[PDB]
Amino acid sequence: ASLTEIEHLVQSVCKSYRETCQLRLEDLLRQRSNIFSREEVTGYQRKSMWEMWERCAHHLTEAIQYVVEFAKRLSGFMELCQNDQIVLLKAGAMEVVLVRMCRAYNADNRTVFFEGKYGGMELFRALGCSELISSIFDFSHSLSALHFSEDEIALYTALVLINAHRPGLQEKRKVEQLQYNLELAFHHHLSKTHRQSILAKLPPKGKLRSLCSQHVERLQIFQHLHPIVVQAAF
Numbered sequence: 001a002s003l004t005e006i007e008h009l010v011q012s013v014c015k016s017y018r019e020t021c022q023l024r025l026e027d028l029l030r031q032r033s034n035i036f037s038r039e040e041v042t043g044y045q046r047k048s049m050w051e052m053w054e055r056c057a058h059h060l061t062e063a064i065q066y067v068v069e070f071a072k073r074l075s076g077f078m079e080l081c082q083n084d085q086i087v088l089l090k091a092g093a094m095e096v097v098l099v100r101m102c103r104a105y106n107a108d109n110r111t112v113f114f115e116g117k118y119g120g121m122e123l124f125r126a127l128g129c130s131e132l133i134s135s136i137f138d139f140s141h142s143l144s145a146l147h148f149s150e151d152e153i154a155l156y157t158a159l160v161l162i163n164a165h166r167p168g169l170q171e172k173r174k175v176e177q178l179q180y181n182l183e184l185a186f187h188h189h190l191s192k193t194h195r196q197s198i199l200a201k202l203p204p205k206g207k208l209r210s211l212c213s214q215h216v217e218r219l220q221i222f223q224h225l226h227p228i229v230v231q232a233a234f
């Protein structure tokens with residue numbers, strides 16, 4: 001693989017991102033002054049457990065759709081069999097959503113963009129999963145300190161999806177080669193931007209995994225349905 005091939009894979013991944021990112025970074029940054037008032041917060045805390053889980057599962061569904069669209073536009077992914085695609089999307093898609101959320105997270109006041117405004121942890125009291133909420137906030141806080149650029153996000157989330165160490169893969173050799181090529185791309189682009197320093201600072205791969213799993217566990221506990229099943233409907 002040549003320099004031109006590597007730079008093209010970079011441009012193709014970043015383009016696929018830019019087209020599927022759902023929320024424009026500029027919009028999210030500008031919306032940072034648009035903070036929920038006490039009464040609105042109280043308005044959310046008073047809502048039913050059932051309602052809050054309905055709202056949250058719906059936003060998650062939408063976000064997963066965009067991430068699935070991202071994946072389909074990564075070179076090679078479509079060329080994999082339906083089984084291997086779904087194997088990669090099963091946990092991978094939701095792991096990507098949780099990384100993407102650091103863009104909608106403001107470290108200065110520890111708030112998150114939710115349904116049009118920024119609000120802190122207390123917004124989600126009705127859900128009755130404070131430790132799950134804490135885990136998201138703390139993961140998003142640690143990622144924000146890295147100041148991910150749009151392209152770093154793009155490249156890093158491609159690697160989250162395209163990973164050969166996932167249960168029950170068939171064309172495992174071919175996913176290893178797709179993972180290899182995107183690793184070259186990510187590394188090349190980091191050196192070019194003198195941003196190699198983030199490599200050691202990236203969240204341990206199994207931290208994002210165990211976070212995703214615990215959230216999926218609790219999501220299904222509220223009688224919903226695994227996100228992979230829902231996504232299959234489209």
Ligand SMILES: O=S(=O)(c1ccccc1)N(CC(F)(F)F)c1ccc(C(O)(C(F)(F)F)C(F)(F)F)cc1
Nearest residue numbers: 055056057059060063097112113114132215216219
């Ligand atoms: O917009 S969300 O509802 C959101 C929740 C918490 C903080 C900010 C934003 N949504 C974000 C998404 F990007 F997916 F749209 C979201 C919904 C639900 C979750 C959950 O992790 C779970 F369990 F449903 F997967 C939880 F409900 F627990 F928070 C996480 C994020």
